[PDB]
């Protein structure tokens, strides 16, 4: 039986979602699940390797080792918040040669938001604003370059973090200077972009060959029909770093009728709307299909 | 043989000139070496041996001068959470070597966490009461997780340990407070929140040895007469951590007539007003007296 | 009833050890226990404050808040190992004005081993080697000063860590250089001291007015009679940073008959030998006595 | 108008002199700006605008020169875990700005974690086999907790990501391995362990564009003829991360006749031997050709 390690929080019972799924209608799939914080590993160039997972057995913490044949990463591999760095585990998994969704290569390169955004910048130069309306954004390697903004208000996004973390709205120059000094204390990079007075925002997702668009109506659901414009946004983004099996594009719709793409997320993208259960099943088949190629 | 005094301060002030002619016991001369924390390193041995190394430029080449200070005057901040502002190990090394200092190395070390210093002031307020020691209301958060709200707005949030306005922001409402806490998380350190004071002017009461002065500066200059009120503020504060030879107390004077003590500063306090020259001579006198005792 | 917060691992049931103890034979003591990693807090200058403890209730993680009237710290407040920094909690407790054993002031100043060692260096200059045989040791603020050792082998101790962590034996110059480069990666201070070929080592402890000496026979019990020589070692060390209620002195006995004091530990000192249960009871009375003064 | 080339390298080499006279399409001139990572900063905008700022000394004052490179040649390491050796955000910024480079910014970024690079070599060994690609046996540890033992001694432990011998130690036995792991914990990063090779000599096979050279250096120099064996090592490695215009493979030759590939280097590879001058001209040629394509 093939062993699948799924790195996600306990809320979703992936074992139950993969129950009965087989590779070539004959080989069974054993699902192992845990969060990055409860994992460790050792990998050898000769191919030998082990993944150690801390779990609870009869009220006591124990370590059980496994050897995944495949991995599904649903959690962020990196966050500049304390204790949120698991890049070394991603490196170890690649070192062990274990296949993954999304690919370990893409997961590693997704560990710096501005690095991913740089990929969108290139796509925007290539496609033009009409087809790919990337929001204006400025990147500062560190606080020394954060002197001013030519327009206000702007949204400052500090380092690499998720779920609203490290993000603030700045209304004037004096406050921008105060915020830049806070960036100094984070000792990392930051970006600034025009604040969009949004009527609503839109997220276009792509799991395998399945698409869905959702309208979400400052720091914040109804589904909407896919359009070829939306399809292009996510299709082109899904091509970076060798290809993203699970990804989505976030855009803000201004009260002036303009769209502004502000981010592309990877295999850790949250499932939203009234069809989350369906999305999990779609993820299962994609994983199953990917595992079949081995 | 002359007694060597190391002054840690920027070059602007020529302490050698100010100490020129000064003698210990009217016979022993004083040799003045001066450098900034960034130009220093050292090695100390439990047996008493040590060397304070000063990096200097010679014939366009980086060379090192080895000194054995008999005493040290510290005029720069020993710590800042901004990149490369950490000189705590030098303070540790100077104490390891047993070198006497102004202010004391013990107090300098304990002054490296603003809230730790504020904690002493909290104790003094509990003891003396509001009328005599009007300490501003303040809240300490070990980390961003406890920053949920503020009973009153606007507030001034001060992040970690930093100087010259760095990491200090004015928050006007609850939602903004939340966004600011999401950024505190990127600093990975503590923070405090205190009521924003609509000040009419702020006052700073300084004490150098036995010389007192008071200055009035009217959101981030006139000398005024000392009062027994002011004298009590600085006399009380000057006693913490075994005693501060040089220190000052900063208080904001609200428009409703209330005073709010917001900070106590050590030997790094900047010299201000039309008596800076006199203050420097006063420091010279204080140090020579401290040096005489050894 | 007075609330006592004991910060220690779960192995010891402090509630059971404090069961029945009363202040003035009438006031009861409610014992709360948890580790630094499961705690957080908020403190206000006006005296208001809360300590939040994460615990498990029916298999789920919950937060219950308390307001300790006193604290007993049996765990290290700082370790440079990942996620081992709880200095901000110690700062918060002092900010809230909560009494402790050992004192919060001493616990804070014990967060840098070389800073504590500097205190022993001063005691050695004062008492002399015959009475206080402090081991030779060299302090490096950073790796740039770690060039060589005049004798080998030596023991290199990196940064601030416990239970053998960060400590290695270096036999020659080339290896010393390799180790110094490792120090560069820790980006912190380090010390080097002669390697003692020890017949055995000795630890002299002092809990309140109770003393005990233990012989422990490279990186490693039988009790031994207190002597006035041993008593002097711990008595003098127990006086630093305003006084240590719980502390011990570690010394190595060379095969050449010389003793070498290498460290002084605080209220987190481990209980050893066949009288640990007794030591816990002695700790209880000291705490009870200390609490009675409030 | 001339095309601007920014060379990131130490001053020792005068790339302006080597590029002097070179022209793109025989008509367009090349302007050479040169600086070290430590002297650079930048700001990049999604709209294409950007500025690479070079700090320089003018009339004894620190001033900034703003440049807009059309291409960049990177000859220095972009990352080191030693204090202030982190220039990853500059690499991110140069890509954000869309500036073409040698080696590619993508490969430079992915080369910032030695084991991540080694993981690619692991893959190549699995594919080509030992006879053609003799990759040394190596073990990857995400952190110190998994470092428990080594099947064979002595071993060479390499900590985190650093250069010029930094963080690399030779361990001769099990107990020492444990002590070394206790220090890895202070580095708070990953480490690898590989068999110590009792080498007779080591070889480095380099590839600059289409020019190959091989050098023999006989525990931490003669040119030899290229072989199809050597050509295959560097040709294979030169293909990772989309292709390496400049790279080299380091292999240790054991006394038992076995070869052990221990490392692949990128555009920062030092120039060695009696053909350094020629190698520089070869790099000039390679860059001019890459610049011609734009
Ligand atoms: N330029 C902007 N103008 C207006 N609102 C913005 C802007 N950027 C972000 N926001 C708001 O802030 C929210 C959070 O920001 P964003 O989506 O960039 O970060 P995040 O959700 O923390 O990122 P991650 O996907 O890593 O979790 C957005 O969903 C949106 O409501
Ligand atoms: N609660 C407050 N209300 C209004 N203004 C404040 C308040 N706290 C600080 N300020 C203003 O900010 C200025 C600087 O803040 P503060 O003195 O606390 O820090 P700092 O100057 O950065 O510290 P340091 O003295 O270390 O350099 C004060 O002089 C005052 O003008
Ligand atoms: N100079 C030395 N010579 C020989 N052995 C030494 C020396 N220093 C330490 N050791 C050995 O290493 C052990 C651990 O070192 P040490 O006691 O200094 O650190 P630790 O126990 O990690 O400190 P902590 O008390 O913070 O837990 C000692 O108990 C002793 O066996
Ligand atoms: N397994 C090994 N056995 C014996 N010697 C080794 C081994 N690994 C490395 N060395 C020696 O150490 C030298 C330097 O190590 P290595 O090239 O791995 O790192 P480095 O030079 O620090 O890295 P970089 O190339 O980034 O600067 C090698 O040239 C070789 O002489
Ligand atoms: Ca988002
Ligand atoms: Ca101030
Ligand atoms: Ca010890
Ligand atoms: Ca090398």
PDB file of N, CA and C in Angstrom, chain B residues 100-171:
ATOM      1  N   UNK B 100      35.092  50.221  35.844  1.00  0.00           N
ATOM      2  CA  UNK B 100      34.114  51.140  36.448  1.00  0.00           C
ATOM      3  C   UNK B 100      33.529  52.040  35.367  1.00  0.00           C
ATOM      4  N   UNK B 101      32.270  52.430  35.527  1.00  0.00           N
ATOM      5  CA  UNK B 101      31.610  53.228  34.504  1.00  0.00           C
ATOM      6  C   UNK B 101      30.546  54.226  34.963  1.00  0.00           C
ATOM      7  N   UNK B 102      30.225  55.158  34.067  1.00  0.00           N
ATOM      8  CA  UNK B 102      29.184  56.160  34.287  1.00  0.00           C
ATOM      9  C   UNK B 102      28.347  56.187  33.007  1.00  0.00           C
ATOM     10  N   UNK B 103      27.074  55.786  33.076  1.00  0.00           N
ATOM     11  CA  UNK B 103      26.449  55.286  34.299  1.00  0.00           C
ATOM     12  C   UNK B 103      27.000  53.880  34.537  1.00  0.00           C
ATOM     13  N   UNK B 104      26.664  53.284  35.678  1.00  0.00           N
ATOM     14  CA  UNK B 104      27.153  51.946  36.013  1.00  0.00           C
ATOM     15  C   UNK B 104      26.788  50.934  34.936  1.00  0.00           C
ATOM     16  N   UNK B 105      27.677  49.978  34.697  1.00  0.00           N
ATOM     17  CA  UNK B 105      27.403  48.963  33.694  1.00  0.00           C
ATOM     18  C   UNK B 105      26.145  48.184  34.096  1.00  0.00           C
ATOM     19  N   UNK B 106      25.945  47.980  35.396  1.00  0.00           N
ATOM     20  CA  UNK B 106      24.763  47.263  35.865  1.00  0.00           C
ATOM     21  C   UNK B 106      23.501  47.991  35.415  1.00  0.00           C
ATOM     22  N   UNK B 107      23.440  49.303  35.636  1.00  0.00           N
ATOM     23  CA  UNK B 107      22.253  50.036  35.228  1.00  0.00           C
ATOM     24  C   UNK B 107      22.131  50.088  33.706  1.00  0.00           C
ATOM     25  N   UNK B 108      23.254  50.208  33.003  1.00  0.00           N
ATOM     26  CA  UNK B 108      23.208  50.258  31.544  1.00  0.00           C
ATOM     27  C   UNK B 108      22.586  48.974  30.998  1.00  0.00           C
ATOM     28  N   UNK B 109      23.011  47.832  31.531  1.00  0.00           N
ATOM     29  CA  UNK B 109      22.500  46.526  31.113  1.00  0.00           C
ATOM     30  C   UNK B 109      20.996  46.409  31.388  1.00  0.00           C
ATOM     31  N   UNK B 110      20.579  46.792  32.590  1.00  0.00           N
ATOM     32  CA  UNK B 110      19.169  46.720  32.959  1.00  0.00           C
ATOM     33  C   UNK B 110      18.304  47.756  32.240  1.00  0.00           C
ATOM     34  N   UNK B 111      18.941  48.737  31.608  1.00  0.00           N
ATOM     35  CA  UNK B 111      18.201  49.753  30.871  1.00  0.00           C
ATOM     36  C   UNK B 111      17.946  49.278  29.440  1.00  0.00           C
ATOM     37  N   UNK B 112      18.395  48.065  29.106  1.00  0.00           N
ATOM     38  CA  UNK B 112      18.224  47.547  27.750  1.00  0.00           C
ATOM     39  C   UNK B 112      16.858  46.972  27.366  1.00  0.00           C
ATOM     40  N   UNK B 113      15.853  47.221  28.196  1.00  0.00           N
ATOM     41  CA  UNK B 113      14.475  46.802  27.928  1.00  0.00           C
ATOM     42  C   UNK B 113      13.638  47.912  28.544  1.00  0.00           C
ATOM     43  N   UNK B 114      13.075  48.769  27.701  1.00  0.00           N
ATOM     44  CA  UNK B 114      12.287  49.880  28.202  1.00  0.00           C
ATOM     45  C   UNK B 114      11.224  49.504  29.239  1.00  0.00           C
ATOM     46  N   UNK B 115      10.426  48.452  28.990  1.00  0.00           N
ATOM     47  CA  UNK B 115       9.406  48.090  29.988  1.00  0.00           C
ATOM     48  C   UNK B 115       9.987  47.618  31.328  1.00  0.00           C
ATOM     49  N   UNK B 116      11.220  47.109  31.307  1.00  0.00           N
ATOM     50  CA  UNK B 116      11.873  46.638  32.527  1.00  0.00           C
ATOM     51  C   UNK B 116      12.193  47.878  33.351  1.00  0.00           C
ATOM     52  N   UNK B 117      12.543  48.949  32.655  1.00  0.00           N
ATOM     53  CA  UNK B 117      12.840  50.211  33.316  1.00  0.00           C
ATOM     54  C   UNK B 117      11.512  50.802  33.810  1.00  0.00           C
ATOM     55  N   UNK B 118      10.495  50.754  32.956  1.00  0.00           N
ATOM     56  CA  UNK B 118       9.178  51.284  33.305  1.00  0.00           C
ATOM     57  C   UNK B 118       8.619  50.542  34.529  1.00  0.00           C
ATOM     58  N   UNK B 119       8.916  49.248  34.636  1.00  0.00           N
ATOM     59  CA  UNK B 119       8.434  48.460  35.766  1.00  0.00           C
ATOM     60  C   UNK B 119       8.909  49.077  37.080  1.00  0.00           C
ATOM     61  N   UNK B 120      10.127  49.620  37.082  1.00  0.00           N
ATOM     62  CA  UNK B 120      10.655  50.253  38.286  1.00  0.00           C
ATOM     63  C   UNK B 120       9.826  51.506  38.582  1.00  0.00           C
ATOM     64  N   UNK B 121       9.478  52.251  37.534  1.00  0.00           N
ATOM     65  CA  UNK B 121       8.683  53.459  37.700  1.00  0.00           C
ATOM     66  C   UNK B 121       7.281  53.117  38.191  1.00  0.00           C
ATOM     67  N   UNK B 122       6.768  51.966  37.761  1.00  0.00           N
ATOM     68  CA  UNK B 122       5.450  51.525  38.199  1.00  0.00           C
ATOM     69  C   UNK B 122       5.505  51.363  39.714  1.00  0.00           C
ATOM     70  N   UNK B 123       6.579  50.733  40.185  1.00  0.00           N
ATOM     71  CA  UNK B 123       6.781  50.510  41.609  1.00  0.00           C
ATOM     72  C   UNK B 123       6.825  51.847  42.346  1.00  0.00           C
ATOM     73  N   UNK B 124       7.552  52.817  41.795  1.00  0.00           N
ATOM     74  CA  UNK B 124       7.662  54.128  42.431  1.00  0.00           C
ATOM     75  C   UNK B 124       6.331  54.873  42.477  1.00  0.00           C
ATOM     76  N   UNK B 125       5.480  54.657  41.478  1.00  0.00           N
ATOM     77  CA  UNK B 125       4.185  55.321  41.460  1.00  0.00           C
ATOM     78  C   UNK B 125       3.295  54.713  42.543  1.00  0.00           C
ATOM     79  N   UNK B 126       3.339  53.391  42.679  1.00  0.00           N
ATOM     80  CA  UNK B 126       2.551  52.693  43.692  1.00  0.00           C
ATOM     81  C   UNK B 126       2.904  53.267  45.069  1.00  0.00           C
ATOM     82  N   UNK B 127       4.196  53.496  45.276  1.00  0.00           N
ATOM     83  CA  UNK B 127       4.732  54.011  46.531  1.00  0.00           C
ATOM     84  C   UNK B 127       4.463  55.494  46.813  1.00  0.00           C
ATOM     85  N   UNK B 128       4.764  56.359  45.849  1.00  0.00           N
ATOM     86  CA  UNK B 128       4.596  57.800  46.029  1.00  0.00           C
ATOM     87  C   UNK B 128       3.234  58.404  45.681  1.00  0.00           C
ATOM     88  N   UNK B 129       2.434  57.705  44.885  1.00  0.00           N
ATOM     89  CA  UNK B 129       1.129  58.235  44.515  1.00  0.00           C
ATOM     90  C   UNK B 129       1.161  59.199  43.339  1.00  0.00           C
ATOM     91  N   UNK B 130       0.005  59.374  42.698  1.00  0.00           N
ATOM     92  CA  UNK B 130      -0.135  60.246  41.529  1.00  0.00           C
ATOM     93  C   UNK B 130       0.248  61.711  41.688  1.00  0.00           C
ATOM     94  N   UNK B 131      -0.142  62.328  42.798  1.00  0.00           N
ATOM     95  CA  UNK B 131       0.176  63.737  42.994  1.00  0.00           C
ATOM     96  C   UNK B 131       1.672  64.010  42.903  1.00  0.00           C
ATOM     97  N   UNK B 132       2.478  63.196  43.577  1.00  0.00           N
ATOM     98  CA  UNK B 132       3.924  63.405  43.538  1.00  0.00           C
ATOM     99  C   UNK B 132       4.632  62.761  42.331  1.00  0.00           C
ATOM    100  N   UNK B 133       4.169  61.595  41.889  1.00  0.00           N
ATOM    101  CA  UNK B 133       4.792  60.890  40.756  1.00  0.00           C
ATOM    102  C   UNK B 133       3.703  60.455  39.762  1.00  0.00           C
ATOM    103  N   UNK B 134       3.249  61.373  38.887  1.00  0.00           N
ATOM    104  CA  UNK B 134       2.200  61.082  37.901  1.00  0.00           C
ATOM    105  C   UNK B 134       2.588  60.251  36.673  1.00  0.00           C
ATOM    106  N   UNK B 135       2.879  58.972  36.905  1.00  0.00           N
ATOM    107  CA  UNK B 135       3.253  58.047  35.838  1.00  0.00           C
ATOM    108  C   UNK B 135       2.079  57.849  34.887  1.00  0.00           C
ATOM    109  N   UNK B 136       2.343  57.908  33.586  1.00  0.00           N
ATOM    110  CA  UNK B 136       1.276  57.729  32.604  1.00  0.00           C
ATOM    111  C   UNK B 136       0.732  56.314  32.664  1.00  0.00           C
ATOM    112  N   UNK B 137      -0.541  56.154  32.316  1.00  0.00           N
ATOM    113  CA  UNK B 137      -1.158  54.833  32.285  1.00  0.00           C
ATOM    114  C   UNK B 137      -0.499  54.094  31.130  1.00  0.00           C
ATOM    115  N   UNK B 138      -0.119  52.843  31.342  1.00  0.00           N
ATOM    116  CA  UNK B 138       0.507  52.083  30.268  1.00  0.00           C
ATOM    117  C   UNK B 138       0.178  50.610  30.429  1.00  0.00           C
ATOM    118  N   UNK B 139       0.179  49.889  29.318  1.00  0.00           N
ATOM    119  CA  UNK B 139      -0.101  48.462  29.341  1.00  0.00           C
ATOM    120  C   UNK B 139       1.042  47.722  28.651  1.00  0.00           C
ATOM    121  N   UNK B 140       1.495  46.635  29.274  1.00  0.00           N
ATOM    122  CA  UNK B 140       2.574  45.819  28.730  1.00  0.00           C
ATOM    123  C   UNK B 140       2.027  44.511  28.157  1.00  0.00           C
ATOM    124  N   UNK B 141       2.438  44.196  26.933  1.00  0.00           N
ATOM    125  CA  UNK B 141       2.038  42.971  26.249  1.00  0.00           C
ATOM    126  C   UNK B 141       3.334  42.199  25.941  1.00  0.00           C
ATOM    127  N   UNK B 142       3.473  40.966  26.460  1.00  0.00           N
ATOM    128  CA  UNK B 142       4.671  40.144  26.230  1.00  0.00           C
ATOM    129  C   UNK B 142       4.851  39.842  24.743  1.00  0.00           C
ATOM    130  N   UNK B 143       3.732  39.817  24.026  1.00  0.00           N
ATOM    131  CA  UNK B 143       3.720  39.580  22.589  1.00  0.00           C
ATOM    132  C   UNK B 143       2.368  40.015  22.030  1.00  0.00           C
ATOM    133  N   UNK B 144       2.258  40.035  20.708  1.00  0.00           N
ATOM    134  CA  UNK B 144       1.043  40.476  20.019  1.00  0.00           C
ATOM    135  C   UNK B 144      -0.271  39.763  20.356  1.00  0.00           C
ATOM    136  N   UNK B 145      -0.192  38.511  20.796  1.00  0.00           N
ATOM    137  CA  UNK B 145      -1.388  37.730  21.104  1.00  0.00           C
ATOM    138  C   UNK B 145      -2.324  38.327  22.164  1.00  0.00           C
ATOM    139  N   UNK B 146      -1.782  39.100  23.099  1.00  0.00           N
ATOM    140  CA  UNK B 146      -2.605  39.704  24.143  1.00  0.00           C
ATOM    141  C   UNK B 146      -3.127  41.091  23.774  1.00  0.00           C
ATOM    142  N   UNK B 147      -2.702  41.622  22.631  1.00  0.00           N
ATOM    143  CA  UNK B 147      -3.178  42.938  22.207  1.00  0.00           C
ATOM    144  C   UNK B 147      -4.530  42.772  21.533  1.00  0.00           C
ATOM    145  N   UNK B 148      -5.592  42.942  22.308  1.00  0.00           N
ATOM    146  CA  UNK B 148      -6.932  42.776  21.778  1.00  0.00           C
ATOM    147  C   UNK B 148      -7.719  44.073  21.705  1.00  0.00           C
ATOM    148  N   UNK B 149      -7.499  44.961  22.664  1.00  0.00           N
ATOM    149  CA  UNK B 149      -8.217  46.222  22.664  1.00  0.00           C
ATOM    150  C   UNK B 149      -7.627  47.234  23.627  1.00  0.00           C
ATOM    151  N   UNK B 150      -8.193  48.431  23.599  1.00  0.00           N
ATOM    152  CA  UNK B 150      -7.766  49.511  24.468  1.00  0.00           C
ATOM    153  C   UNK B 150      -9.032  50.199  24.950  1.00  0.00           C
ATOM    154  N   UNK B 151      -9.140  50.380  26.258  1.00  0.00           N
ATOM    155  CA  UNK B 151     -10.314  51.016  26.823  1.00  0.00           C
ATOM    156  C   UNK B 151     -10.524  52.438  26.303  1.00  0.00           C
ATOM    157  N   UNK B 152      -9.452  53.088  25.857  1.00  0.00           N
ATOM    158  CA  UNK B 152      -9.570  54.445  25.333  1.00  0.00           C
ATOM    159  C   UNK B 152      -8.679  54.697  24.120  1.00  0.00           C
ATOM    160  N   UNK B 153      -9.152  55.567  23.234  1.00  0.00           N
ATOM    161  CA  UNK B 153      -8.426  55.943  22.028  1.00  0.00           C
ATOM    162  C   UNK B 153      -8.372  57.455  21.940  1.00  0.00           C
ATOM    163  N   UNK B 154      -7.347  57.995  21.266  1.00  0.00           N
ATOM    164  CA  UNK B 154      -6.278  57.243  20.602  1.00  0.00           C
ATOM    165  C   UNK B 154      -5.185  56.787  21.571  1.00  0.00           C
ATOM    166  N   UNK B 155      -4.347  55.852  21.130  1.00  0.00           N
ATOM    167  CA  UNK B 155      -3.243  55.369  21.960  1.00  0.00           C
ATOM    168  C   UNK B 155      -1.946  55.389  21.178  1.00  0.00           C
ATOM    169  N   UNK B 156      -0.840  55.381  21.902  1.00  0.00           N
ATOM    170  CA  UNK B 156       0.473  55.362  21.291  1.00  0.00           C
ATOM    171  C   UNK B 156       1.067  53.994  21.621  1.00  0.00           C
ATOM    172  N   UNK B 157       1.359  53.220  20.581  1.00  0.00           N
ATOM    173  CA  UNK B 157       1.949  51.906  20.754  1.00  0.00           C
ATOM    174  C   UNK B 157       3.453  52.045  20.534  1.00  0.00           C
ATOM    175  N   UNK B 158       4.228  51.466  21.442  1.00  0.00           N
ATOM    176  CA  UNK B 158       5.679  51.511  21.359  1.00  0.00           C
ATOM    177  C   UNK B 158       6.145  50.063  21.315  1.00  0.00           C
ATOM    178  N   UNK B 159       6.744  49.691  20.191  1.00  0.00           N
ATOM    179  CA  UNK B 159       7.200  48.329  19.962  1.00  0.00           C
ATOM    180  C   UNK B 159       8.635  48.033  20.371  1.00  0.00           C
ATOM    181  N   UNK B 160       8.801  46.924  21.089  1.00  0.00           N
ATOM    182  CA  UNK B 160      10.112  46.495  21.535  1.00  0.00           C
ATOM    183  C   UNK B 160      10.959  47.569  22.183  1.00  0.00           C
ATOM    184  N   UNK B 161      12.257  47.512  21.909  1.00  0.00           N
ATOM    185  CA  UNK B 161      13.211  48.461  22.474  1.00  0.00           C
ATOM    186  C   UNK B 161      13.933  49.148  21.319  1.00  0.00           C
ATOM    187  N   UNK B 162      13.639  50.428  21.126  1.00  0.00           N
ATOM    188  CA  UNK B 162      14.245  51.203  20.048  1.00  0.00           C
ATOM    189  C   UNK B 162      14.228  52.684  20.412  1.00  0.00           C
ATOM    190  N   UNK B 163      14.965  53.493  19.656  1.00  0.00           N
ATOM    191  CA  UNK B 163      15.076  54.915  19.962  1.00  0.00           C
ATOM    192  C   UNK B 163      14.739  55.883  18.825  1.00  0.00           C
ATOM    193  N   UNK B 164      14.722  57.174  19.156  1.00  0.00           N
ATOM    194  CA  UNK B 164      14.440  58.251  18.196  1.00  0.00           C
ATOM    195  C   UNK B 164      13.135  58.113  17.424  1.00  0.00           C
ATOM    196  N   UNK B 165      12.075  57.685  18.096  1.00  0.00           N
ATOM    197  CA  UNK B 165      10.788  57.544  17.436  1.00  0.00           C
ATOM    198  C   UNK B 165      10.543  56.218  16.740  1.00  0.00           C
ATOM    199  N   UNK B 166      11.586  55.412  16.558  1.00  0.00           N
ATOM    200  CA  UNK B 166      11.433  54.126  15.878  1.00  0.00           C
ATOM    201  C   UNK B 166      10.472  53.180  16.592  1.00  0.00           C
ATOM    202  N   UNK B 167       9.572  52.570  15.821  1.00  0.00           N
ATOM    203  CA  UNK B 167       8.615  51.618  16.371  1.00  0.00           C
ATOM    204  C   UNK B 167       7.482  52.192  17.216  1.00  0.00           C
ATOM    205  N   UNK B 168       7.211  53.482  17.073  1.00  0.00           N
ATOM    206  CA  UNK B 168       6.164  54.118  17.848  1.00  0.00           C
ATOM    207  C   UNK B 168       5.090  54.654  16.906  1.00  0.00           C
ATOM    208  N   UNK B 169       3.864  54.186  17.094  1.00  0.00           N
ATOM    209  CA  UNK B 169       2.754  54.591  16.248  1.00  0.00           C
ATOM    210  C   UNK B 169       1.545  55.050  17.054  1.00  0.00           C
ATOM    211  N   UNK B 170       0.784  55.971  16.473  1.00  0.00           N
ATOM    212  CA  UNK B 170      -0.428  56.487  17.099  1.00  0.00           C
ATOM    213  C   UNK B 170      -1.576  55.713  16.464  1.00  0.00           C
ATOM    214  N   UNK B 171      -2.428  55.136  17.303  1.00  0.00           N
ATOM    215  CA  UNK B 171      -3.571  54.357  16.842  1.00  0.00           C
ATOM    216  C   UNK B 171      -4.839  55.102  17.279  1.00  0.00           C
TER     217      UNK B 171
END
